[PDB]
Amino acid sequence: EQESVKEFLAKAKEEFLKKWESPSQNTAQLDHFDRIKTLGTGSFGRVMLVKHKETGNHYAMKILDKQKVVKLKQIEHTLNEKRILQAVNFPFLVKLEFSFKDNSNLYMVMEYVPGGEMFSHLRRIGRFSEPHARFYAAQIVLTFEYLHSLDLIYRDLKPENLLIDQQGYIQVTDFGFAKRVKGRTWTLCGTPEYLAPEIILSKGYNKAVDWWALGVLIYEMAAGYPPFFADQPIQIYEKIVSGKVRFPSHFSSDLKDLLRNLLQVDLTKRFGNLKNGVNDIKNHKWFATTDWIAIYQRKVEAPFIPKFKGPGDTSNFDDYEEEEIRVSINEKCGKEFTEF
Numbered sequence: 001e002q003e004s005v006k007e008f009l010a011k012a013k014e015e016f017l018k019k020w021e022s023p024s025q026n027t028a029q030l031d032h033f034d035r036i037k038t039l040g041t042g043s044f045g046r047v048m049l050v051k052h053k054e055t056g057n058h059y060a061m062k063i064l065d066k067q068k069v070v071k072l073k074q075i076e077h078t079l080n081e082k083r084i085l086q087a088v089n090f091p092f093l094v095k096l097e098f099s100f101k102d103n104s105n106l107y108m109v110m111e112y113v114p115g116g117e118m119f120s121h122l123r124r125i126g127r128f129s130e131p132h133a134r135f136y137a138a139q140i141v142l143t144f145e146y147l148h149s150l151d152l153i154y155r156d157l158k159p160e161n162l163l164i165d166q167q168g169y170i171q172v173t174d175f176g177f178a179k180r181v182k183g184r185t186w187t188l189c190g191t192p193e194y195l196a197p198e199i200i201l202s203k204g205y206n207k208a209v210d211w212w213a214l215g216v217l218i219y220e221m222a223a224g225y226p227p228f229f230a231d232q233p234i235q236i237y238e239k240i241v242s243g244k245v246r247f248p249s250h251f252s253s254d255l256k257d258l259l260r261n262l263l264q265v266d267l268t269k270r271f272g273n274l275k276n277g278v279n280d281i282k283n284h285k286w287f288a289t290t291d292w293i294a295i296y297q298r299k300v301e302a303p304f305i306p307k308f309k310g311p312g313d314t315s316n317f318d319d320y321e322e323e324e325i326r327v328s329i330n331e332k333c334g335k336e337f338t339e340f
């Protein structure tokens, strides 16, 4: 790599480590915000649009029920999520603005990205052209270069986690499975269609699982469906471990070649995990037209700008039953979440 890239990554790691070793805590409280709308809901958490009462700024507030986090064995993962988010800084990562906890819940207050999930847009139009897929893919390549340099594995790449901003660029959200890992790690996590073979086979695995997931994402953007699709998890897993893939005839030869090298079952032969690291991806013929500096600087005109009316518009997200944010009179799970 050029000295300029080496010096940029060295500064990025220094700045990350300073916040990683001394994390911020307790930087807001719940009654500083008005609740507007639920934007999504899961097994132990929800995300809600909120407005700060004094400044009028909008934010996306992720709320985790401490008792449910414990029951679903996510304690370490939720502590990882907040400690990583308060320490990172990159153009294609959603920014954490505040965090706090109370007797019942954990709270992460993010910037709100009003354009919606990539997934919605992809499903509405069917598939993206190769230039359109390549613009988003280039942003993920740079983001993974940054995260991997800091010894972070992301472990949750999928179209639902890629939000489209007011300039039509990507911001990656949901660090619930992200982890600082210097060698190998072992937890079964991720979404079925995006899992690498070594995760499915219960091996010790490393950052190469993110590069496999990038191959699944590029395939899905350019085709409209993921490569290993099937009706039940066990059948998806059989396809993933098999070492074969079928490509639509509309794919270019360069796209097919790049995907065979990212979707390589043998992790020791997979692009992103060879001696030249990310440069085997950046220098591939499919990326020959990509100006990497111009993408990082946000100087390239985006394929499209999402339609929305302003920073409070929720029209690009869907509708959920609205439930209370109740806070108990007794502290739950205080020892488990001391460091949050």
Ligand SMILES: COc1ccc(-c2noc(C(=O)O)c2[C@H](C)O)cc1
Residues within 6 Å of the ligand: 004, 005, 008, 009, 142, 143, 145, 146, 293, 296
């Ligand atoms: C992983 O993401 C990166 C973004 C950017 C750089 C970078 N590499 O060289 C320069 C330069 O200043 O010439 C830069 C930025 C624009 O400062 C490197 C990596």
Ligand SMILES: COc1ccc(-c2noc(C(=O)O)c2[C@H](C)O)cc1
Residues within 6 Å of the ligand: 120, 121, 122, 124, 125, 128, 129, 132, 303, 304
């Ligand atoms: C240049 O090629 C494009 C492909 C796709 C889109 C697109 N992706 O999602 C939507 C949506 O309506 O959600 C659209 C447009 C605005 O209709 C835009 C441009």
